[PDB]
């Protein structure tokens with residue numbers, strides 16, 4: 001189809017100063033850090049991710065696939081790649097989402113997260129995903145853990161290690177084995193390994209459930225082998241306490257067997273927008289940096305021709 005004219009930026013290692021670990025994942029460490037472009041005279045907070053440590057040609061392939069996808073997106077609700085650095089090991093460098101991921105965030109702040117935020121974030125994720133849909137791009141790993149907090153009023157979708165572009169105007173993506181987050185997967189993704197924009201919807205349904213239960217674990221207790229069945233019998237996640245039937249009703253729809261019966265991300269945006277206009281009618285909740293930051297700027301503010 002259309003030619004992908006994204007500009008992958010190569011970055012010198014002298015161009016940015018690492019400052020601390022944020023996630024020494026088994027798969028690879030992720031750092032906080034600063035980037036000071038060529039001679040631009042601006043510093044930009046960034047997250048830096050290198051494939052664990054050792055360079056195994058096998059691993060290198062995937063980190064770059066992420067770099068590829070992440071460099072091909074440009075929307076206020078999706079995390080974009082700033083560029084890569086080809087030192088001994090490959091690094092992905094992107095804008096810093098200071099507050100970490102949304103999951104941890106709700107857990108850490110239950111007693112202060114109001115309805116306005118919950119629905120507002122539900123809107124922002126619906127937007128990000130709708131963007132990816134437009135870019136014919138299936139995420140395959142939508143979850144609360146993979147949404148990052150820029151500010152409490154601004155979340156963006158990240159982690160494209162499993163995304164997939166759709167070519168030859170094909171609809172359902174057939175994939176391999178490996179490690180897949182079952183609890184967030186659509187039924188088709190579990191039985192036929194079929195993935196699609198509409199299976200992303202399902203994962204969205206579970207993501208919205210996460211945020212509404214303040215960070216609970218889906219099907220907690222249960223074990224993934226067990227899952228496919230259950231879901232098969234007809235069982236779905238329960239209605240979260242703070243949830244009106246209206247909201248839970250939208251969650252259930254992202255979980256219907258007939259994948260074309262679920263809502264499109266563009267409808268989910270509309271529906272949540274309405275609700276966000278009167279957040280108290282839809283959610284019932286009890287009670288509703290160490291530098292010459294003189295030249296510090298934020299990615300979303302640093303742009304280059306395009």
Ligand SMILES: CCN1CCN(Cc2ccc(-c3cc4c(N[C@H](C)c5ccccc5)ncnc4[nH]3)cc2)CC1
Pocket residue numbers: 022023030047048049079092093094095096097098099100101104105108148158159
């Ligand atoms: C009380 C909560 N506690 C302390 C605050 N945070 C720490 C934290 C802060 C930022 C981040 C963070 C991760 C991250 C991030 N991770 C993704 C996987 C990424 C992908 C490619 C390149 C860089 C990052 N990307 C961009 N910005 C990010 N910021 C992670 C953890 C959560 C744990």
